[PDB]
Amino acid sequence: SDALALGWPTGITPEAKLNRELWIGSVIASFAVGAIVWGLIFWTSAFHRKKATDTELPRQFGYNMPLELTLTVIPFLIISVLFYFTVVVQERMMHKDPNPEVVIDVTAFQWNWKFGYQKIAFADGSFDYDGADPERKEAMTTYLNFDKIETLGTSSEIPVLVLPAGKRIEFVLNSADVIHGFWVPEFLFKRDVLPEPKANNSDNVFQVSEIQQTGAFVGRCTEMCGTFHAMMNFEVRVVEPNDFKAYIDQRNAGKTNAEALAAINQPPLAITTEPFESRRG
Amino acid sequence: SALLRTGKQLFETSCVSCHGANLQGVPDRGPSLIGTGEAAVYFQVSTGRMPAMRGEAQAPSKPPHFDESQIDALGAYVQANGDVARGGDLFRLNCASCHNFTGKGGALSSGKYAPDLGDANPAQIYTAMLTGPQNMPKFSDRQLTPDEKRDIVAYVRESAET
Numbered sequence: 001s002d003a004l005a006l007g008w009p010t011g012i013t014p015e016a017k018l019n020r021e022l023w024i025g026s027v028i029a030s031f032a033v034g035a036i037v038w039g040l041i042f043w044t045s046a047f048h049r050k051k052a053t054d055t056e057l058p059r060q061f062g063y064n065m066p067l068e069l070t071l072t073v074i075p076f077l078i079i080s081v082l083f084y085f086t087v088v089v090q091e092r093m094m095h096k097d098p099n100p101e102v103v104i105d106v107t108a109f110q111w112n113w114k115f116g117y118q119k120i121a122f123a124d125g126s127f128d129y130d131g132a133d134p135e136r137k138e139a140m141t142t143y144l145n146f147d148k149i150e151t152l153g154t155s156s157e158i159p160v161l162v163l164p165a166g167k168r169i170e171f172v173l174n175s176a177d178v179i180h181g182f183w184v185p186e187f188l189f190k191r192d193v194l195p196e197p198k199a200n201n202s203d204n205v206f207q208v209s210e211i212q213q214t215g216a217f218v219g220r221c222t223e224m225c226g227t228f229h230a231m232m233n234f235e236v237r238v239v240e241p242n243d244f245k246a247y248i249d250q251r252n253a254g255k256t257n258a259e260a261l262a263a264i265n266q267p268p269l270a271i272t273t274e275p276f277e278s279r280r281g
Numbered sequence: 282s283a284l285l286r287t288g289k290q291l292f293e294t295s296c297v298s299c300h301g302a303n304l305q306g307v308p309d310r311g312p313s314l315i316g317t318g319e320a321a322v323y324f325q326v327s328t329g330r331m332p333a334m335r336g337e338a339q340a341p342s343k344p345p346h347f348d349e350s351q352i353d354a355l356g357a358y359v360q361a362n363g364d365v366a367r368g369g370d371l372f373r374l375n376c377a378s379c380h381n382f383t384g385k386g387g388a389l390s391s392g393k394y395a396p397d398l399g400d401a402n403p404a405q406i407y408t409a410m411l412t413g414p415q416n417m418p419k420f421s422d423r424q425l426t427p428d429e430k431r432d433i434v435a436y437v438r439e440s441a442e443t
């Protein structure tokens with residue numbers, strides 16, 4: 001249940017909840033076989049050299065050709081019942097859909113996670129923002145995705161990303177300088193952001209099917225960036241779908257997350273993480 | 282304030298040759314101002330056909346095209362209209378793409394250092410960032426708030442002085 005899964009958080013997407021169902025396939029495979037091998041090494045501690053079989057060397061047997069064939073196929077069929085479930089689950093992931101229902105650029109620059117919003121089309125067909133200006137992009141003579149509802153997140157603001165909690169979400173994963181990493185640990189999933197993903201034969205993007213919980217969760221950076229790699233914390237918020245429509249309408253007129261999250265009566269700063277004292281000074 | 286009579290006569294003496302509100306050297310860049318302001322029009326464009334006339338540091342010299350009262354007056358005449366932590370993060374997010382390691386995206390030899398910026402000061406940097414030079418697009422209003430512009434200007438200034 002909770003102890004057999006060695007510390008995984010309960011997934012909030014239905015694709016992450018499939019990992020935690022597969023992670024307790026440690027029981028069927030690892031801790032089962034890992035107790036058989038302990039059950040033979042600690043079984044040969046009742047086989048000491050006692051003072052009766054002292055002038056008699058043992059049977060001196062070296063080749064048992066039925067045993068290296070039975071105990072080869074049995075480790076082979078366990079990794080043949082794997083490479084089935086770990087192909088089905090990664091095919092449940094890596095999945096795309098031409099109605100993504102919100103598209104969020106993440107644009108991991110050097111050390112503080114500049115987010116941003118692109119086109120969004122709910123299943124009701126009611127919101128339909130669709131904002132990503134190409135005229136700002138033509139000021140750079142690139143691969144980055146610029147837009148107008150971006151969340152900057154300076155060194156003391158600790159960027160809070162807001163996304164609804166019943167809809168499909170797409171994360172276009174870009175980076176300005178170095179390969180960083182994008183890891184909300186509650187999304188039991190992680191993809192490294194690259195400088196130029198379409199030039200590196202990368203896939204650049206992933207999608208979650210929905211979110212099944214409300215609240216607000218931590219996000220960290222994983223692949224190493226440099227000095228302040230431990231300071232790149234972002235913090236998603238899974239607001240209601242009705243509070244998300246009131247988030248952008250306060251934000252489209254132009255405010256900040258200290259003011260846009262206040263109009264939907266939610267704590268404006270990050271509540272599961274906070275800026276570091278070792279970096280601000 | 283800046284004397285607009287001095288500003289008109291300075292425009293006629295030194296800028297009418299390439300600019301009649303137009304530009305004869307790069308046609309579209311004459312009535313085209315991005316994030317136009319008195320501070321930006323005052324700041325010497327670091328790239329393009331003509332470099333800023335001001336002598337290095339704003340010191341008196343024998344080849345200055347102008348003195349300070351003349352600059353302010355002309356910048357005003359053209360302008361008729363009729364936290365270092367934040368600074369470092371803003372630099373990395375918006376300017377590192379072309380100015381990584383204090384360098385220049387257009388030319389490797391060209392740099393953001395004071396020798397490259399001559400008579401640089403915080404105000405001159407802030408102004409080019411606001412509306413910007415020919416090489417980099419304007420940042421004020423469009424991309425960065427005043428605190429962010431102020432912080433990034435300070436960070437660039439401290440990095441170049443040290």
Ligand code: HEC
Pocket residue numbers: 139140141326327328329371372375376377378379380385386387392393394397398399406409410414415416417418433434437
């Ligand atoms: C996509 C292009 C581009 C971006 C983005 C850009 N710049 Fe520039 N910058 C230039 C070019 C080109 C020059 C050379 C001056 C010219 O264009 O004549 C320049 C020159 C400068 C200079 C003067 C250096 C000198 O010696 O003359 C400063 C100061 C400067 N930039 C600051 C910034 C700051 C601060 C940012 C972001 C926070 C930034 N730039 C982003 C293209 C860019």
Ligand code: HEC
Pocket residue numbers: 292295296298299313314315321322323324325326327328329330331332352355356359413414415416
């Ligand atoms: C009183 C103000 C003023 C006078 C006089 C002036 N300029 Fe400029 N110049 C500017 C400003 C401000 C810019 C920055 C571009 C902008 O306005 O967007 C600039 C930019 C330039 C650039 C492009 C540099 C770059 O990197 O983008 C060239 C070339 C130039 N000027 C040439 C000249 C020449 C040649 C003269 C006179 C023979 C001249 N200028 C007189 C204000 C002036």
Ligand SMILES: [Cu+2]
Pocket residue numbers: 108111179180181221222223224225229232
């Ligand atoms: Cu990172």
Ligand SMILES: [Cu+2]
Pocket residue numbers: 180181221222223224225228229230232
């Ligand atoms: Cu990192």
